[PDB]
């Protein structure tokens, strides 16, 4: 499908070959797709405890031809979804802790001094004017402050 072709174009040949090796390990009978039986089996062998309904939910999430099983191109979609979700999570979680730390007076906002120290502590030389412009551009609602959602969006 459309979506399977996008997922593949996102991955290197090298990643795809590593995913095919894992897929071949789920596909216990070599038949070409992962069943409910097979998915639960390796999930339980990796210390997970899914319910049958959770096994069904996972399959249906990527099950584009309605077979009730996962073929390799569907597997690759499950993998790209997981990576992008990981990545997105890691970034927000890190920027949340950066905002926390450099909001040194704990008023809930980042001002131009605090913003200038984020950049210096990061090892990037920035000018005062650079900082004040980022402040301006970043201040979307024009209250003169940078709140968290403006911070996120700015970085
Ligand atoms: Ca199989
Ligand atoms: Ca459980
Ligand atoms: Ca079902
Ligand atoms: Ca259903
Ligand atoms: Ca399928
Ligand atoms: Ca502050
Ligand atoms: Ca603002």
Swiss-Prot record:
Modified residues (N-acetylthreonine): 1
Protein residues bound to Ca(2+) 1: 27, 29, 33, 38
List of residues binding Ca(2+) 2: 63, 65, 67, 69, 74
Entry's Gene Ontology molecular function annotations: calcium ion binding; troponin T binding
Binding site for Ca(2+) 4: 139, 141, 143, 145, 150
Binding of Ca(2+) 3, residues: 103, 105, 107, 109, 114
Domain of life assignment: Eukaryota
SMART domains from the UniProt entry: EFh (SM00054)
Pfam assignment, any one: EF-hand_7
SUPFAM superfamilies found in the cross-reference section: EF-hand
Domain EF-hand: 14-49, 50-85, 90-125, 126-155
GO cellular component: myosin II complex
Misc: Skeletal muscle troponin C binds four calcium ions.
Free-text function comment from the UniProt entry: Troponin is the central regulatory protein of striated muscle contraction. Tn consists of three components: Tn-I which is the inhibitor of actomyosin ATPase, Tn-T which contains the binding site for tropomyosin and Tn-C. The binding of calcium to Tn-C abolishes the inhibitory action of Tn on actin filaments.
Family: Belongs to the troponin C family.
PANTHER family: MYOSIN LIGHT CHAIN 1, 3, TROPONIN C2, FAST SKELETAL TYPE
Name assigned to this protein: Troponin C, skeletal muscle
Gene designation per UniProt: TNNC2
